[PDB]
Symmetry: C2
Subunit: 257 residues, 2 copies
């Protein structure tokens, strides 16, 4: 065998997990261990469940809310965490059964409405900025700072921003950042001695999830090795190093307003 | 909704076809319309069949030879081309039933042996140089000019070289160039206004072929749209233009020895 085949040990989901950890780490630095009575998180995809699981140790009650009911499949069936679809959450709110002191909005572009958010009175409000590199259309579609507006000078307000250092990503979306990370890594790996080519093992996940509601297929596909390499040399370690370096190019922080 | 999903009309196979056409055009310019009694082409993947069908108009007999029998699946039922595995071809040689005046070697790295080639006496010999940008391991593994050595100054000898302008590719392989073209295109498409991300729809085709022998799955996978785009705006025309521009970076020519 002169030509070999090497799959990275790092999977697509490992990349998404690492990015999710950086994002929550930014939140943890922002909150500084403050405890809450009731947390509401909007948006399960893609790192809403992780956020809920982590904040649950600092909160008596945690609600994870999504406009799509099928997203419940991503929420395991026991913990301080309660999943609700948006309509269920609105109903309980009207009944005065929820009154969160921490609200986290992860819905991004075309997500939750400022009008709805304005009905609440949290101690702390965090919204994830979906924007990435400068882009006229994306900037126009974004209304992040209209979501923060009702809480300014009334609550502790933070805007979560995630970017790639000296690299281009169009959004701060976990999967988008994952895609760009893996694609970039495949290009750098290609340059390694003896490598013939490197394939980024990505699929169109939002068609699978939001148009077929097939979570298990989604989970199966992201469990694939991030990159498959055709090479004359064992470059596995070097490939893992490139993936790790690209992951660490990702920088997440919370801007306080 | 706000976010759209757009597939390119160009499929993966369309890219490979374009590259195959550029490669053959270089061969056709080299051959200058010379006609032959018997053509032997080594290596069907990925553009051996196309070469065979085109040369069939200029030859009384065309043999397409591969070390792998399952490669026969790439040779359609509606042509004059004759497939032989290497052992069958060798057997015909021993019986004195083959004596090609044109030999085309497309096997690339670790391919056909110079010793075996030296057994023949063609009028014209063409070898595809598998190399791309300089790579110490690939350069060492290549023995293109030891394959030409027995035919120098006795026959018309050409070395087919295929490269990417202002880009790095490690080999001249049709699929390799296809992979690099589509990945590069997806990155450039990503930069367009309103585009959120772009996925290159590539698979690990050599696992499907050499280790599942599933040509139908391969053909099915390459018939997929080259790139899937998540975007706020309809950028289909611009995406096809970018894909076309990247394809046109590929340049093929035959160096006469
Ligand atoms: C586009 S994803 C955002 C991804 C996330 N910001 C990240 O970086 O990984 C939006 C998620 O929030 C949910 N969502 C969208 N609109 C919502 C709304 N109005 N209220 C609650 N959830 C919503 C969607 O179902 C989807 O799961
Ligand atoms: C790596 S591919 C070459 C791809 C081609 N040069 C291109 O650019 O598309 C090699 C092909 O030649 C065949 N092959 C490899 N060794 C061979 C040999 N010794 N004799 C005949 N065919 C061979 C393989 O089955 C495979 O189909």
């Amino acid at each position: 065998e002169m030509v070999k085949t090497i799959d990275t040990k790092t999977r697509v989901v490992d990349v998404t997990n690492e990015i999710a950890k950086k994002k929550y780490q930014a939140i943890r630095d922002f909150l500084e261990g403050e405890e809450f009575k009731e947390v509401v998180i909007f948006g399960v995809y893609l790192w809403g469940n992780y956020t809920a699981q982590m904040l649950s140790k600092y909160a008596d009650k945690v609600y994870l809310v999504d406009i799509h009911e099928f997203m419940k499949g991503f929420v395991p069936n026991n913990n301080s965490i309660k999943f609700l679809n948006l309509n269920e959450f609105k109903l309980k709110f009207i009944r005065g059964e929820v009154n969160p002191d921490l609200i986290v909005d992860l819905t991004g572009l075309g997500g939750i409405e400022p009008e709805f958010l304005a009905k609440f009175n949290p101690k702390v409000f965090i919204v994830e900025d979906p924007k990435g590199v400068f882009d006229v259309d994306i900037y126009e579609a974004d209304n992040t700072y209209k979501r923060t507006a009702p809480f300014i000078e009334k609550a502790k307000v933070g805007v979560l921003k995630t970017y790639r250092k000296a690299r281009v990503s169009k959004t701060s979306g976990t999967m988008t950042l994952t895609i760009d990370t893996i694609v970039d890594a495949s290009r750098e790996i290609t340059s390694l001695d003896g490598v013939l080519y490197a394939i980024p093992n990505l699929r169109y996940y939002e068609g699978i999830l939001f148009h077929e509601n097939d979570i298990h297929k989604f989970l199966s596909e992201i469990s694939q090795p991030a990159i498959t390499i055709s090479t004359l040399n064992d470059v596995l370690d070097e490939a893992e190093e490139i993936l790790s370096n690209n992951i660490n190019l990702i920088y997440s922080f919370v801007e306080e307003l």
